Ligand SMILES: O=C(O)[C@@H](Nc1ccc2oc(=O)[nH]c2c1)c1ccccc1OCc1cc(-c2ccccc2)ccc1Cl
């Protein structure tokens with residue numbers, strides 16, 4: 251926190267030393283003294299994180315400024331004298347109180363970097379064409395309803411970020427900005443995209459999440475540099491056929507929360523380089539046979555909350571998959587071919603209609619997380635003993651009456667979620683779960699026993715048993731809750747000497 255006199259002391263130091271950078275940031279300055287006009291040797295002025303509500307016209311004397319950093323102040327305007335900054339390359343105005351781009355900024359035609367994030371800007375003037383050297387323009391988190399056609403005169407634009415505004419369309423002249431590689435349009439109101447979009451042959455990241463798009467232009471097939479395309483939460487029900495076949499480096503695609511009833515049509519060429527595929531919250535009724543036969547590096551597929559009633563014949567060929575989310579479908583069984591997924595670390599199957607699991611589940615030797623909550627499981631296969639990497643197993647609200655004795659081979663298991671089942675007892679093999687930390691048993695109205703070997707679980711720090719009768723245990727013990735129950739199992743069981 252600097253007083254006026256301290257700020258003066260710092261300007262006088264900087265001009266004395268003929269320094270080219272003056273940093274007065276993070277100082278709670280309310281006013282910048284006029285004396286800064288003497289610092290004509292300055293090429294960089296940092297004034298960010300202060301309490302400035304106005305910038306003195308004297309700053310326009312800093313004829314050699316290349317960088318002016320003004321973020322996190324309360325500026326609502328800039329002096330016209332900033333005309334004189336003929337070399338200003340970068341201007342940073344985010345987190346201020348601008349209701350507009352100050353009109354002088356449109357005369358700083360040497361700018362290549364303009365940051366206006368988090369303001370209240372409502373307009374971008376036709377004059378934006380004066381700034382033909384801009385390569386990075388960021389106006390996200392403002393109140394822009396429209397981009398002018400003059401935006402197409404920024405042929406050096408590399409990064410255009412207009413996230414979190416109110417755009418309903420884009421000017422077709424945006425297609426003249428053929429150098430754009432990062433275009434973020436998330437959280438607007440976009441009703442469509444112009445067909446000139448395919449001109450952007452260097453575009454590699456296109457963010458369209460949270461808009462009102464109902465269709466994609468077939469021209470998007472020509473953005474062959476695309477590496478990541480996010481269309482989450484629009485109203486898209488189909489893609490032009492073989493659009494994705496044309497996207498030869500696409501590696502991350504999100505179609506979540508749209509209107510799809512099928513996969514995009516066009517054969518396995520669509521997903522050959524795909525690494526992450528997010529299609530949750532649609533009505534996709536099947537995974538086509540063959541779509542991932544070329545997807546050498548597919549490793550995250552999210553199909554949560556669709557209309558899957560089974561899995562395709564070639565499902566076990568997805569041998570590089572790491573995370574597979576199939577929750578909130580209508581699956582009635584998992585095919586024995588699940589055993590092919592030797593890379594699988596995360597399997598999410600919650601809230602389907604499963605009564606049993608396949609034997610092949612035991613071949614998933616890398617599986618770390620298995621989420622089976624809200625099914626109808628009536629038993630666990632004995633092959634679960636071979637899930638040697640299993641660390642989290644969630645079974646909340648199934649129909650289990652017991653566990654397989656093989657469950658005690660799961661020595662990496664830290665979290666066992668058994669709440670809301672029909673358990674009558676746990677196996678004595680519970681006791682070799684060396685790393686068990688969390689055991690949830692709440693709401694098992696038929697569980698009248700706990701095995702003594704639960705005392706052998708030396709890392710057990712969390713247990714719930716609310717609404718379990720436990721009537722083979724002394725009433726006042728189980729009334730005391732988990733601390734007394736575990737204490738009773740350790741001191742009054744056969745392992746008293748080794749725990
Ligand atoms: O939120 C994030 O993790 C990135 N931001 C983002 C993450 C996912 C998004 O889906 C959208 O629809 N928009 C998104 C933005 C982040 C974080 C910190 C700094 C910069 C960031 O990224 C800038 C950016 C990203 C993209 C893009 C579009 C689609 C997929 C992936 C990246 C385009 C232009 C820019 Cl300038």
Ligand SMILES: [K+]
Pocket residue numbers: 483484485507508
């Ligand atoms: K939607």
